[PDB]
Design a protein around this ligand. Structure first.
Ligand SMILES: NC(=O)[C@H]1CCCN(C(=O)Cc2cc(C(F)(F)F)ccc2C(F)(F)F)C1
Ligand SMILES: [Zn+2]
Length: 139
């Protein structure tokens, strides 16, 4: 569980989205596991606009923040689940670090702000859905 609150937008994992999220839908992409819905209250998360490859992510399964090195956003294959069939997820960044079911939604941050959210994991690895290319989140 977890979301990004920037201006009048809420950013969540698409597979974790609520009824409210779908009834107030702005944009969604299954191939990125992202969904953006509208909000009445104003959010103050700063989204990073950079090509950083080091940052810090929140791991709810350990109740701890962890520093990580992470790869450039790319098309990576992701095994089947009760939410999606086997497929390549786009805009995904990998890091060596702990994650287990229940960790999706944890924020990855760099010195410039929010980079993305936990979206995949397993085998001593963690995957993040990048949000830095979504320039419209700020306007
Ligand atoms: N983006 C997807 O299609 C996800 C959907 C949920 C499930 N997805 C996973 O990665 C599986 C899983 C979840 C987690 C996460 F929550 F950190 F992701 C950690 C580990 C694992 C593991 F190791 F058991 F396979 C794909
Ligand atoms: Zn940065």
């Amino acid at each position: 569980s977890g979301a990004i609150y920037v201006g009048n937008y809420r950013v969540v994992n698409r597979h974790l989205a609520t009824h409210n999220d779908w009834a107030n839908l702005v944009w969604e992409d299954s191939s990125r596991d992202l969904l953006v819905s509208s909000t009445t209250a104003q959010g103050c998360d700063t989204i990073a606009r950079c090509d950083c490859q080091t940052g810090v992510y929140y791991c709810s399964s350990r109740r701890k923040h962890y520093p990580v090195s992470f790869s450039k956003p790319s098309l990576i294959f992701v095994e089947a689940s009760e939410y999606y069939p086997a497929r390549y997820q786009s805009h995904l960044m990998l890091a060596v670090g702990h994650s287990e079911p229940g960790d999706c939604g944890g924020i990855l941050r760099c010195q410039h702000g929010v980079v993305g959210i936990v979206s995949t994991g397993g085998n001593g690895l963690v995957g993040f859905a990048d949000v830095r290319d979504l320039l419209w989140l700020d306007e």
